Amino acid sequence: GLTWFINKFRIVK
């Protein structure tokens, strides 16, 4: 999905 991107990115932030 597209939401997975940001979501997964959050962990990096």
CSV table of C-alpha atoms in Angstrom, one decimal:
chain,number,residue,atom,x,y,z
A,1,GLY,CA,0.0,0.0,0.0
A,2,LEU,CA,0.9,3.7,0.0
A,3,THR,CA,0.3,4.3,3.7
A,4,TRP,CA,3.0,1.7,4.5
A,5,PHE,CA,5.6,4.1,3.1
A,6,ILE,CA,5.1,6.9,5.5
A,7,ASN,CA,4.3,4.5,8.4
A,8,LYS,CA,7.5,2.6,7.8
A,9,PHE,CA,9.3,5.9,7.4
A,10,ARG,CA,8.1,7.1,10.8
A,11,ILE,CA,10.3,4.5,12.5
A,12,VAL,CA,13.3,6.1,10.7
A,13,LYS,CA,12.4,9.6,11.8
